[PDB]
Each structure stands twice: as structure tokens, then as C-alpha cells.
């Protein structure tokens, strides 16, 4: 589970 | 001992540059050597194939370079709102 990485990576663009 | 994939590789790369460009007060292209390295790291963590530990030090590695990332963005908004 890798989400909350992937969700924060998203957010900094 | 094992194969490091080039995906991973480029991963890798990227990091040691960010830290070089970082430790240097390059804050902007720090920023996108993070940044372009958490893209690789998520990347080979989900579609590649590896082991828990392997899997674990991703995700480890992954969290720090986020966390910095994130505290220079937030210092490169505060440098721009100066003018």
C-alpha cells in the first residue's frame, strides 16, 4: 500500500 | 547478490544529484531532482517485482525525499512572495 506516498507525490506537481 | 533495474537506477541518480544540488542551495533544481526521483521510486515499487525489504527501503527512501521536497516548495513560495 502505497497511496498516501502517491497521493502526496500528485499534490506536488 | 542481485540486479538493480534501470528504472530504479534513474532513481537512484536523481536522488544523489537532488542531495548534491540541495546541500549546494540549488533549492529549485533540487526540487525537481526529488521530485523526478519519487516519480521513479513509486514507479519501480509498483510495477516492478522485489522483496519486502526491498520494498520497504522504497518506501523509507520515498518518504524523506517527499518530506524535503515538500519543505522547498514551501521555502521557493515564501523566496517568490518576497516581490
Known amino acids: 500500500d502505497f497511496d498516501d506516498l502517491s497521493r502526496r507525490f500528485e499534490e506536488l506537481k | 547478490m542481485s540486479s538493480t533495474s534501470p528504472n530504479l537506477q534513474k532513481a537512484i ?3 544523489s544529484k537532488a542531495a548534491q544540488e540541495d546541500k549546494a542551495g540549488n533549492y529549485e533544481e533540487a526540487l525537481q531532482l526529488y521530485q523526478h526521483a519519487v516519480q521513479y521510486f513509486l514507479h519501480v515499487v509498483k510495477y516492478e517485482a522485489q522483496g519486502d525489504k526491498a ?3 522504497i518506501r523509507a527512501k520515498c518518504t ?3 518530506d524535503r521536497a515538500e519543505k522547498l516548495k514551501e521555502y521557493l513560495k ?3 512572495k518576497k516581490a
Do not use: P, R, T, V
Request: aromatic content about 8%; overall charge negative; proline content about 0%.
Open chain 2, 55 to 57: 520494498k520497504q527501503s
Open chain 2, 13 to 15: 541518480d536523481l536522488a
Open chain 2, 64 to 66: 524523506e525525499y517527499l
Open chain 2, 78 to 80: 515564501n523566496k517568490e
